Amino acid sequence: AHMKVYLDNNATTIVDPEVKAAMDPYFTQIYGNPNSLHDFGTECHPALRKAMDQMYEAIGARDEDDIVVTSCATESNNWVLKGVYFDLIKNGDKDHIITTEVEHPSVTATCRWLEEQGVRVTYLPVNQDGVVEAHTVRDFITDKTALVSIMWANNETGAIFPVEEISEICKEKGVLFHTDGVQAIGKIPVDVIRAGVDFMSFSAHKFHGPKGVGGLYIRNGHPLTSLLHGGEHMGGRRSGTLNVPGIVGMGKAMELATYYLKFEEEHVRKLRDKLEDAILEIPDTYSVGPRENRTPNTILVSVRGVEGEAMLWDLNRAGIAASTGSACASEDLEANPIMVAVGADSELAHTAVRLSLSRFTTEEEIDYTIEQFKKAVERLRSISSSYA
Amino acid sequence: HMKVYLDNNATTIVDPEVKAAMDPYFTQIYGNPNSLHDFGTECHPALRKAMDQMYEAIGARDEDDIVVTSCATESNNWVLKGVYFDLIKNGDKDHIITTEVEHPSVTATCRWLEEQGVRVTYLPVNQDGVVEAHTVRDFITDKTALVSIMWANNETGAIFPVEEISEICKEKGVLFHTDGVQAIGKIPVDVIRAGVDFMSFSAHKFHGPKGVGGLYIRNGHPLTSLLHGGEHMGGRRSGTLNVPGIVGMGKAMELATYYLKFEEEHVRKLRDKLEDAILEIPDTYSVGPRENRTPNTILVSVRGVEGEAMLWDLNRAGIAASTGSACASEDLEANPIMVAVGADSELAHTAVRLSLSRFTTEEEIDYTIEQFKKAVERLRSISSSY
C-alpha cells in the first residue's frame, strides 16, 4: 500500500462532503418525526420536499409518477418482483417473468424464490456485447408474461442495455418493464420517460450518497402491493419512519450526480481510457465488452497468465481497491480470441479484474495503478509453469 | 417562550456521541463491508463492536441472531409475513393472535394477512391497557401460527406481561414475537427472560439514527427472508449494510442500557413531577397505572378540551407532544376513569401524550406545567359544555 487508491466505485462510493453537510443537521439539531403535527416534526418538511424534487428532476420523472423511498435497491427489487407476482401472477392470468443472467443478486435470488412459488422465469443469457437485445425479449414474451426486468447498466462490465427499444417491444406487448438502474445514475443520462420503463430501482450509495437509502420509480403511480405495510408513509406505499438524513442526502447526491455527468463523460472517461489502454498494452489481456456501449468509469480485464483473485489481492497489497467479474473465452467475426461477459453460475466462467472510477479519481491514481498492475501481472506470470 | 420536546415516543434526538461514533463512516471510511480489499474491510471492527453492543444490550445469546433491518416496520412485516409463508401458506396453520393496540406496522400487515385468508384475533385490551396471559391461552387454537404482542404500548406506556405470555406460548408450542420498540432504554430488556422468539426494535426510539432497525431471532429460528438476494446478515436480510446506522445503533443501545441502570430516577422523577402537577388540575385523568408504565410517558385526558386542540395550543407555546386514544369507563370502585382503546373504536376520544427522554430538564418540566395549566384554562373558557 505505497499509495491508497479506490477503484471499486461500482461496489460503493464515498459520500460527497456536500452530501454529508446536507445530511448533518438531521440527526440532533433537526430530529422530529416528519409525521408529527408539532413544529419539531414539521421543521424538516422543506428539506424533504426539496429532496423529492431533486430526485424527480435527476431521473426526469413527471408529476403523475411516483418516487418511493426505500432502504436500498435490494428492497426496491424485492418490492417490484414480489408485488408484480402478487398482483398479476397469484391474482392475474400471468405466471412468467423475463430477466437476464447478469442481474444483481437482489433480482436473481428473488426470481429463484418466485420460481419456488411456481413462477416461470426466463433468465435470458447475455450476448457478445454483454447485453440482451430487444428482439430477444420479444421472442420470449408470450401472453402470460407479467413483467420484464432487465438492468439498465451492468455492474461487472458497465455494459449499457438498450432499455428504450426493450420498452418499445414491451409496450407493444402490454408488458410491464422494470429496470435495475442502480449503475445508471451519475454514469449515463437517465430519463425514465425516454427509457419508457414502468419501474426503476436505484441506490444512493452508488452515486456518492449515504448507504441505507434507495428508491423505486413507479410510472403513473401504477398499483403495486406494498412490501412494507403499516403507516401511510410515502403515499401509503412504503411504511416506516422516513430516513430523513438518508432522504436529504440522496436528493443532494442525485442533484450532484446530474451536475457531474458531463465531467464523468469527459475527464473520468479520459482517465478510464488511459488506464484501459495502458493495461491492454500488456500481452494476452482482454477487455470485456465494447467501450462504445460502456459506462465511462468501468473496465473489466481478463489476463490469461494470472488468476483474478490473486491479482486482486496483489492490487490490494499495493493499496488499490478493485473487484471481480465473470468472463469467458469466445471469438469475434474475424475469429480473433476475445473475452465476453457471462453469468457467474456458468461452467465457462473465469475471474476478471473490475476497475471502476469515480468523479474523484485522479491521474496520479491512474498512473500508480498502471504501474502496479503491470508489476502484478509480471510477478504472477513469472511463477506460472503453464503460461506461454 | 421556550421550545420543549416531549414527544419522545415518536422519535428521539440522536445522542451527540452516537453521532460522533457514526461520523467517520460516511466519507472517511466508505468501503463496502462485503468487499475483500482494505477499503471494504476497514469498517469490520466497528461492525463487530456494534453487533456485540446489540447482543449485550438485549441479553441475546451467541446462538441467537440479531438481523439489522431498515426500521421496526420492516422487522414487523418480516416476522408476520415470513411466519405466514412458513406455517400458514406452507403449513397446517391459519391463525395469528395479536392486540388491538399494536403499531400500524403490525395491524395493517395483519389486515393484509386477513386478505390472504388468515384468521387474526385482535385481542381487546383491559383497563390497565395491556392483555394478560390467560386471555392469550384462551385464544390459542391448534392452528395458531404466531402470537404477536408488543412489549410496551407507545401511546400509554403500558408494559405487557411478555414473560408469562411466553410461558403459555411455550406450553402450547406457539411462536411468540413482540414489538419491543418502546422497551429499549425504558425498561429492562432480556430476551431470554422474556422467552420471546422474535423481537423488533428501532434505533431512533432510543437516540440512534433514523433508518436502522433490528429483528432479534431467538436461537436462529427459520424465517423466510423478506429481502432476498445478497447473501448479507447470515443470508437473512439482503442489501448493502447501513454501516453508519449499524455503528450508531450499537452505540445507542449501549448508552440506553447504561442510562437505564444509571439514570432511571431522573427521568422517572421528572415524569412523576409533571404528571402529579397536571393531575392537580380539576377533571384530568391519567390513562393507565403508573406502576405498570414506562417511566417517561404520560397520557392525559382533559375534560372540555379535545386532545388535538390541547396539542395545538401546546405547540403554539413551543411544546411538542402527541395524541393517544382513550375512552371513559369506571373501575370496580365505580369511579370514572379513562382507559386505553384502539384508535378505530367508535367510543374513542383523543388524549394528550407527553413522553420524556433522558435529555428532559427540570426547567422544561416547570415551563410545561405552567403552559399546560395556561392552555387548559385558555381552551376551557372556549369549551361548549365544560
Tell me if A213 and B211 make a contact (CB, 8 A cut-off).
yes
List of domains in chain A: 3-15+261-376 (3.90.1150.10), 16-260 (3.40.640.10)
Q: Report d(CA B70, CA B74) in Å as an integer.
A: 6
| Alpha-carbon gap, residue B156 to B338, rounded angstroms | 11
Cβ neighbours around A95 below 10 Å, total: 18
Q: Is A14 on the interface with B (CB under 8 A)?
A: yes
For chain B, what is the radius of gyration of the CA atoms? 22
Cα separation, A105 vs B319, whole angstroms: 48
| Total residues belonging to chain B | 386
Active site residue B327: yes
- Listed residue (A163, A162, A149) closest to A84, CA to CA: A149
Work out the minimum CA distance from A36 to partner chain B, whole angstroms. 7
Q: Which helix (H) or strand (E) holds A283?
A: none
What is the C-alpha separation between B14 and B358, in angstroms, rounded?
12
Give one DSSP letter per residue of B153-194, joined into a string: -TTT-BBP-HHHHHHHHHHHT-EEEEE-TTTTTTS---HHHH
- Chain B, nearest residue to A240 by Cα: B73
Q: Where are the alpha helices (DSSP H) in A59-94?
A: 73-84
* Residue B102, phi then psi, degrees to nearest 5: -65, 160
**Contact call for A212 and B212, based on CB within 8 A:** yes
Category of B323 on φ-ψ map: left (φ > 0), alpha (ψ -120 to 50) or beta: beta
The one-letter code for the residue type at A187 is: K
Please give the Cα distance from B58 to B373 (Å, whole number): 39
Name the one residue in this structure whose C-alpha cell is 412490501.
A227
Q: Please say whether the beta carbons of B120 and B149 come within 8 A.
A: no
- To the nearest whole Å, the CA of B175 is away from the closest chain A CA by 21
Distance CA A113, CA A111 (A): 5
Question: Which residue in B17, B18, B227 has the most chain A C-beta atoms within 10 A of its own C-beta, making it the best mutation to test that interface?
Answer: B227
In a 3-state reduction of DSSP, which class is residue B202?
strand
Place of cell 432497525: B213
Instruction: Please provide the size of chain A in residues.
Output: 388
Query: What's the CA gap between B282 and B373, in Å, rounded?
Result: 10
Q: Computed from CA positions of residues A151, A152, A155, A160, in that sequence, does the dihedral angle turn out positive or negative?
A: positive
Lookup: cell for B125:
385490551
Cα distance between residue A229 and residue A221, in whole Å: 17
- Calpha distance A384→A108 (Å, rounded): 36
Q: Which among A269, A268, A217 is positioned nearest to A238, based on CA atoms?
A: A217
A42 touches chain B (CB under 8 A): no
Could you say which residues from 110 to 129 on chain A have a Cβ atom under 8 Å away from some Cβ of chain B? 110, 113
Q: Which of residues 295-324 of A touch B (CB under 8 A)?
A: 312-313, 315-316, 319-323
- Which residues are paired to B351 by β-bridges? B324
Nearest CA distance, A210 vs chain B (angstrom): 7
DSSP codes, B215-279:
EEEGGG-----SS-SS--GGGTS-S---HHHHHHHHHHHHHHHHHHHHSHHHHHHHHHHHHHHHH
- Enumerate residues 6+ apart whose C-beta is below 8 A from B296: B8, B9, B157, B186, B267, B268, B271, B355, B356, B357
Q: If you ran DSSP here, which 8-state letter would residue A30 be given?
A: S
For an interface test with B, the pick among A13, A75, A313 (most B C-beta atoms closer than 10 Å) comes out as: A75
B320: chain A residues, CB-CB within 8 Å? 32, 36, 38-41
Closest to A131 in 3D by CA, of A109, A155, A162: A162
Three-class HEC string of A187-225 = CCCCCCCCCCCCEEEEEHHHHCCCCCCEEEEEHHHCCCC
Contacts of B250 (CB under 8 A, 6+ apart): B49, B50, B51, B52, B53, B54
CA atoms of B222 and B199, how far apart (whole Å): 14
Pairing of strands B322-330, B336-340: antiparallel
Q: Which of B2, B3, B8, B26 to mutate to test the interface with A (most CBs of A within 10 A)?
A: B26
Nearest residue, CB atoms, B230 vs list A17, A39, A105: A105
Give CA–CA dist B280/B275, Å, rounded.
8
Say if CB A53 and CB A258 are below 8 A apart.
no
**Pairs across A and B, CB distance < 8 A:** 218
Instruction: Decide if B103 contacts A228 (C-beta within 8 A).
Output: no
Judge: A12–B26 Cβ closer than 8 Å, yes or no.
no
* Cβ-defined contact of A240 to B27 (cutoff 8 Å): no
Could you say which residues from 184 to 243 on chain A have a Cβ atom under 8 Å away from some Cβ of chain B?
Answer: 203, 205, 210-213, 226-231, 239-243
Count of other CB atoms within 10 angstroms of residue B39 = 25
Q: Which three cell numbers stand for residue B379?
A: 381552551
Asked if B101 and B340 touch (Cβ cutoff 8 Å), the reply is yes
* DSSP conformational letter for B378: H
Distances (CA, A) of A219 to A79, A325, B284: 15, 32, 51
Q: How many CA atoms lie within 13 A of B324 on its CB side?
A: 33
Cell of A220: 403513473
Q: What are phi and psi of B148, to 5 degrees?
A: -120, 105
The partner residue sitting opposite A312, judged by closest CB among B30, B36, B74, is B36
Residue of B nearest to A225 (CA): B112
The letter for the amino acid at A54 is Q
Torsion B125-B126-B128-B133 (CA) sign: negative
CA distance A380 to chain B (A): 19
CA distance A301 to A288: 6
**CA proximity to B243, closest of B45, B73, B87:** B45
Could you give the 3-state DSSP secondary structure of residue B135?
helix
Contact residues, chain A, for B314 at CB < 8 Å: 38
Identify residue A104 by its one-letter amino acid code: H
Q: Does A25 touch chain B (CB under 8 A)?
A: no
Contact of A238 with A91, CB cutoff 8 Å = no
C-alpha span between A328 and A338 (Å, rounded): 8
Q: CA-to-CA distance for B380 and B322, rounded, in angstroms? A: 19
Closest CA to B321 of A36, A256, A359: A36
Binary contact (A229, B112; C-beta < 8 A): yes
Q: Computed from CA positions of residues B203, A73, A309, A265, in that sequence, does the dihedral angle turn out positive or negative?
A: negative
The answer to whether the CB atoms of B244 and A211 lie below 8 A apart is: yes
φ, ψ dihedrals at A67, nearest 5°: -125, 105
* Beta-carbon separation of B30 and A15 below 8 A: yes
8 Å CB contact between A341 and A288: yes
Round to whole Å and give the CA distance between A324 and A311: 10
User: Under DSSP, is residue B312 helix (H, G, I), strand (E, B) or coil?
Assistant: helix
Cα distances (Å, whole numbers) of residue A94 to A118, A144, A253, B37, B51: 11, 4, 38, 44, 43
Cα separation, A62 vs A220, in Å, equals 8
How is residue A212 written as a grid cell?
441505507
CB–CB of A230 and B7 under 8 A? no
Residue A95 and residue A226 in contact, taking contact as beta carbons nearer than 8 Å: no
B103 CA to chain A: closest CA distance, Å?
A: 8
β-strand partners of A323: A354
CB contact under 8 A, A71 and B239: yes
Could you give the CA distance from residue B369 to residue B365 in angstroms, rounded to a whole number?
Answer: 6
Q: In Å, how far are A215, B204, B206, B248, B311 from B188, measured between CA atoms?
A: 37, 18, 13, 20, 31
Structure determined via: X-ray
- Within 8 A of A20 by CB-CB distance, chain B residues are 26-27
Q: Do B73 and A239 touch (CB under 8 A)?
A: yes
Under 8 Å between Cβ of B261 and B214: no
Integer CA distances (angstroms), B268 to B11, B128, B186, B205, in order: 19, 19, 10, 17
Report helix, strand or coil for B62: coil
Across the interface, whether the CB atoms of A104 and B229 are under 8 A apart is answered yes
Q: Does residue A107 sit in helix, strand or coil? A: helix
Measured between beta carbons, the chain B residues lying within 8 angstroms of A321 are 31, 35, 37-40
3-class secondary structure, B58: coil
Write out the H or E segment, with its range, that includes residue B131: none
Listed resolution, Å: 2.6
β-strand partners of A97 = A121, A147
- Identify whether the C-beta of residue B75 lies closer than 8 Å to the C-beta of residue B214: yes
> Residue A98 in contact with residue A122, Cβ under 8 Å?
yes
- Residues B46, B232: Cα–Cα separation, whole Å: 17
Q: Which residues contact B2 (CB under 8 A, 6 or more apart)?
A: B318, B363, B364, B367
Q: Which residues of A286-310 are buried (b: 16+ CB within 10 A; e: fewer)?
A: bbbbeeebbbbbbbbbbbbbbebee
Q: What is the largest CA-CA distance in chain B?
A: 72
Helices (H) and strands (E) in chain A, counts: 12, 14
Distance of residue A340 Cα from the nearest chain B Cα, in angstroms: 23
Three-state DSSP state, A234: helix
Residues B204 and A151: their CA atoms lie apart, in Å, by: 34
Question: What is the per-residue burial (b if ≥16 Cβ within 10 Å, else e) of A342-355?
Answer: bbeeeeeebbbbbb
A107–B229 C-beta distance less than 8 A: yes
Distances (CA, A) of A195 to A174, B166, B334: 15, 53, 69
Q: Are B149 and B160 in contact (CB under 8 A)?
A: yes
Name every residue whose Cβ is closer than 8 Å to that of residue A158 and which is 6 or more positions away in sequence. A10, A183, A187, A289, A294, A295, A297, A298, A299, A300, A356
Q: CB–CB of A230 and B106 under 8 A?
A: yes
Report how far residue A123's alpha carbon sits from residue A314's, in angstroms, rounded to the nearest whole number. 34
Q: Which amino acid is at B320?
A: A
Contact list in B for residue A245 (CB cut-off 8 A) is 209-211
Using DSSP, state whether B200 is helix, strand or coil: strand
B38 touches chain A (CB under 8 A): yes
Cell 393472535 sits on residue:
B97
CB contact under 8 A, B240 and A72: yes
Cβ(A129)–Cβ(B254) under 8 Å?
A: no
Q: What are phi and psi of A270, to 5 degrees?
A: -65, -40
